[PDB]
Design a protein around this ligand. Structure first.
Ligand code: HEM
Length: 152
């Protein structure tokens, strides 16, 4: 649960992402894959990537970063009223992709890391707090759907 002022911060931060969605999306995925190499194994289309240089050169990885962040941005713009948008993603990630909730924690922390890395000194303490709360809400509502499905 976020206040109006917290949502305002989230959507202000998101404007930084929307100025370069592919560059942010690329770096988020690279931070996830290099920090948590077990996550790469969930992607049949990226498992061939052995080095970070290959990851950086992959145009398909940048494409998938755009898909991921476009979906998250659509959810965030709903300011918590995201049941219809979140349900298919929870279902696909539990039943088809088999993504444990732990990996959604990993990607949430990776988003925070990338924002500080690309905007050092321009991602303030209030903005980090609000973004963290929004990603927690997203993860918590997915977790409720995972429990319904019995997925671990
Ligand atoms: C911010 C969190 C994330 C969002 C919004 C997101 C969004 C999406 C979207 C929109 C798709 C395509 C449609 C679909 O299959 O439902 C997708 C595919 C996928 N997601 Fe996620 N995702 C997230 C996190 C993750 C994480 C943490 C993993 C794995 C560690 C992952 C693994 C996948 C895989 C394996 C695919 C299929 C890729 C392919 O072969 O085309 N997702 N995701």
């Amino acid at each position: 649960g976020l206040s109006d002022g917290e949502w305002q911060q989230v959507l202000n931060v998101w404007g930084k992402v929307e100025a370069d969605i592919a560059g942010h999306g690329q770096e988020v995925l690279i931070r996830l894959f290099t920090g948590h190499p077990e996550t790469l194994e969930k992607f049949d289309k990226f498992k061939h990537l052995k080095t970070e240089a290959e990851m950086k050169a992959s145009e398909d990885l940048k494409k998938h970063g755009t898909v991921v962040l476009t979906a998250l941005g659509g959810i965030l713009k709903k300011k918590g009223h995201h049941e219809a948008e979140l349900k298919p993603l929870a279902q696909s990630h539990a039943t088809k992709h088999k993504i444990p909730i732990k990996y959604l924690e990993f990607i949430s922390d990776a988003i925070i890391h990338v924002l500080h890395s690309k905007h050092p000194g321009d991602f303030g303490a209030d903005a980090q707090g609000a973004m963290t709360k929004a990603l927690e809400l997203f993860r918590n509502d997915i977790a409720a759907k995972y429990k319904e499905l019995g997925f671990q």
